[PDB]
Each structure stands twice: as structure tokens, then as C-alpha cells.
Amino acid sequence: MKDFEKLYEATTKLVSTSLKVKDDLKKMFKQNGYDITTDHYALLRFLWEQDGISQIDLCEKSCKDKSNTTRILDVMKNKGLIVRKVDVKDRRKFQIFLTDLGRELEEPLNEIASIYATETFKSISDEELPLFTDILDRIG
């Protein structure tokens, strides 16, 4: 039926497809001169939707945890993509803002990611997307 061999394959494919996809996309960013990771692009996506999100919300949005998200954010700050501000209401609590460089990169990075998305999913039909997704949702 769905014996251990298949479940182990499934799990294995899921993890490796995920890794390949992150890594191919990062390579395509680098090929075009953008030295960013997939993690940076995801976080930037949140920020292009809503500037000045608190650190705290952003770690909840992240699909990652606080220690890993915070490290990733330091790198981005170091790359000049965002700044960190002492809050207008509080202290020990920051807001995360786009720099101009961070805003400038919406168009170009989203374009590269589109190109990468269309090719990577060319063999999949539109209608398979919610099936795939609803399976992933019910795993674990």
C-alpha cells in the first residue's frame, strides 16, 4: 500500500526537492549579479508588502524561528538591504525598514524569481497546485 519504503522515498524527495529549489533560485540570483539568498528574498517579500514591520511579527511570519530569522536579518542589514530602528513606542524592541537599495530590488528580484518559477513548474498544471498544497498541508 503505502509501506515504509514509499513513505521514506516521499520524505526524501520532499526534502531534496525543497533544497534543490532554494539552491537553484539562489544560483539564478547570483548568475544575474545579485548576491542574495532565498531567505533574503522571502524576507524582502514581506517587507515590500509592509515596510516597518516589527522584528517580532517578522519572526512569526518567517516560517523560520527567531534565532535563525534574526541572524538572516543581520546579514541583510550588513548587505545594506534593511535598517533596524528603536521603536516609536518602547525600547529593546526594533522595527525593520527597507533602505532604498531594499526597495529598488523588488522589480529585478521578482522578475528573476518569476522566470525561475515558470521554468521550474512548467511540467505541472495549474490545477495540481492546490492538490499539491493541500497534501503538504496535511503532512505532519
Ligand X SMILES: O=C(O)c1ccccc1O
Report the interface residues with a copy of itself, using CB under 8 A: 1-2, 4, 6-22, 24, 42, 45, 63-64, 110, 113-115, 117-124, 126, 128-129, 131-133, 135-140
Q: Does 68 bind ligand X (CB under 6 A)?
A: no
Q: DSSP assignment of 114-128, as one string?
A: HHHHHHHTTTS-TTH
Which of 31, 33, 63, 92 is close enough to bind ligand X by CB under 6 A? Answer: 63
Buried-exposed string 75-114: b where 16+ CB fall within 10 A, e elsewhere: ebeeeebbeeeeeeeeeeebbbebeeebeebeeebeebbe
Nearest to a copy of itself of 42, 83 (CB atom): 42
Q: Does 39 bind ligand X (CB under 6 A)?
A: yes
Residues 6+ away with beta carbon under 8 Å from 28: 112, 115, 116
Nearest to ligand X of 8, 132 (CB atom): 8
| Smallest separation (angstroms) from a copy of itself to the CB of 19 | 7
Grid cell locating 114: 518569476
* H or E stretch covering 76: helix 66-78
φ, ψ at 66 (rounded to 5°): -70, -35
Which of 6, 8, 56, 133 is close enough to bind ligand X by CB under 6 A? Answer: 8
Stretch of 35-43, 46-54, 89-97, 128-136 lying at the interface with ligand X (CB under 6 A): 35-43
Nearest to a copy of itself of 50, 90 (CB atom): 50
Which of 22, 61, 77, 79 is close enough to bind ligand X by CB under 6 A? Answer: 22
